[PDB]
Ligand binder design. Structure first.
Ligand SMILES: N=C1NC(=O)/C(=C\c2ccc(N)cc2)S1
Ligand SMILES: N=C1NC(=O)/C(=C\c2ccc(N)cc2)S1
Ligand SMILES: [Mn+2]
Ligand SMILES: [Mn+2]
Ligand SMILES: [Mn+2]
Ligand SMILES: [Mn+2]
Lengths: 331, 321
């Protein structure tokens, strides 16, 4: 059959897959016990792709840091990225808002790929773009990337805040010129976060959630690893990362977000859980005989990675990382 | 179909700055005009297929953003006119292979042949074309120390291409990035030690052999028709006498192939020769350069003591030997 977009008359519905912060290419705990997260990460990504196809989404939104390396991504990481970008494009048109990009190679690539394809669009400026979704829906994207060049010469703080607000105001005005659906995409830290939300840094863009153009149908955000429903009007969501990158993301819930829009009804969304490996931190004053019993017992059938935190040395520690392949950090 | 119109251009060398050690000249503006003229002629003649060989980028390992932008820009312009097939030259940056594969898979208007693996493509009017690619082999220095089996390796690849060229529908096109043996006279790369291939070892069954890496136009042979289209600008004074441009190949099933040379009309180069630089020499040099719309080289034999800062007063003069 055909492989192009459908064109349904008077269609006022839009199914959206939104995921972010893949951190392709990451290796965790390099200073204690390096663990390549690739296999786990690819599993999570596969599950997201499968849910996208199953739910037959109309549009796929990618925000946040899809790569882990800010300047020097490995070939494997790049290959994995382009591979999954391609897998998603087969499902539905993809819109990519890159995060903190350092190397200039991305901008040329993004522009060229956008110019030759109708199933992927890279938004790398504050300029709104109109895109066509899987079933012919017209969608206006209001992009808000990490400011470049001006962010280096951002001083003073006062004028930088006014620059940001001005960009948001312009985005608001252009959102009023929407044909059908309008979606905001941003890569920054919402003011007043409380969790993780911790790291950073980095040089971060802080933006009040009330400044996000209220007249958009959805506000797709990235940069933070934890899933957060920022607000409901307009619906604003950080999907979070797909794996637990470090132990500050122990209590986090990881995955993507499925969003459905109807022009008469309020927006609804379901979480798509990636079910990544769990993390656990064990706390002790000293690693005594009781603590050894506790540590060995817990790690025994624990399916994820474990960190042990203690206060004081009290003799030669047994080779715990030797007998426990699960243990990745004793500080 | 049973016909096939081809635009074959090569060796753009985007990003090149000529005569760096002497008087550096950014060839971008000139090169773009030449590129613009080639694109216009591909639109006029309404070609079915565009073949790109040779070194489209001048820098081997570290191309500038401006050069990359210009490359992608012109690839895009080519794609609007006809499906594009790119055989990369001596690639060095591993990102190129992934980029090329990705772009090839997401677009039916461009194909990057990164390996020796044959690829079937469709021209502007449905013409099924089998591409037999022969790129600069990576790890070429790994088996180069032997020389013996290195030749045997290259021959094996050519044999496979020959065998694979046999099972083809409609048209079959060879694309290679190497130096044909016996080529005397530019001969300007590396050099260095490139890959040397005997022209008779080019699969005789193909309908056309698109070659790159050579700056000067060369009709290597007629059966099969083998052509280096050459560069679009005169890179250095060795190419002073060259006519620069691309090649319009018109293939017809049954009838013998034909081709026309598409002049790009880049800036002229001139070398002035003197026995020595005397007061009479300076006058003629200044007068010629003032009226010459291109770049000038001056070579002289005898030491003429001290001569005025010609390259400081003559913007046209780019090299003195
Ligand atoms: N399409 C992409 N978007 C990004 O943000 C990417 C990578 C990236 C890598 C490291 C960072 N610190 C931020 C972003 S790749
Ligand atoms: N599309 C392209 N094909 C090439 O061969 C390109 C560049 C290139 C640069 C330096 C070389 N030594 C060989 C090829 S770019
Ligand atoms: Mn970020
Ligand atoms: Mn992040
Ligand atoms: Mn070359
Ligand atoms: Mn060359």
């Amino acid at each position: 059959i055909h492989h192009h977009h459908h064109h349904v008359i008077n269609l006022k519905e839009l199914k959206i897959l939104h995921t972010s912060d893949w951190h392709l290419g990451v290796t965790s705990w390099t200073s204690s016990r390096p663990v390549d997260r690739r296999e786990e990460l690819k599993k999570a990504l596969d599950k997201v792709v499968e849910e996208a196809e199953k739910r037959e989404v109309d549009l796929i939104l990618l925000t946040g840091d899809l790569l882990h390396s800010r300047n020097n991504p490995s070939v494997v990481a790049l290959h994995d990225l382009l591979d999954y970008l391609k897998r998603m494009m087969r499902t539905a048109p993809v819109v990519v808002l890159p995060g903190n990009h350092d190397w200039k190679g991305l901008k040329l690539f993004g522009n060229f790929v956008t110019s030759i394809s109708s199933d992927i669009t890279f938004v790398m400026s504050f300029e709104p773009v109109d895109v066509e979704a899987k079933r012919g829906q017209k969608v206006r994207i209001l992009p808000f990337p990490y400011p470049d060049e001006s962010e280096a010469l951002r001083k003073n703080e006062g004028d930088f805040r006014f620059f940001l607000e001005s960009r948001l105001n312009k985005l608001y005005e252009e959102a009023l010129k929407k044909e059908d659906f309008a979606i905001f995409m941003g890569h920054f830290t919402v003011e007043g976060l409380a969790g993780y939300a911790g790291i950073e840094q980095g040089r971060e863009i802080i933006i009040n959630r009330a400044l996000i153009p209220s007249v958009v149908d959805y506000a797709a955000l990235g940069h933070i690893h934890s899933f957060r429903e920022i607000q409901k009007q307009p619906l604003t969501i950080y999907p979070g990362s797909l794996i637990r990158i470090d132990f500050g993301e122990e209590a986090d819930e990881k995955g993507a977000v499925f969003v459905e829009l109807k022009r008469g009804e309020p927006p609804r969304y379901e979480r798509i859980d990636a079910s990544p490996l769990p993390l656990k931190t064990l706390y002790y004053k000293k690693i005594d005989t009781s603590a050894l019993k506790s540590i060995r017992d817990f790690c025994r059938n624990f399916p994820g990675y474990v960190r042990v935190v203690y206060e004081e040395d009290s003799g030669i520690l047994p080779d715990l990382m030797g007998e426990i392949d699960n243990l990745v950090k004793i500080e």
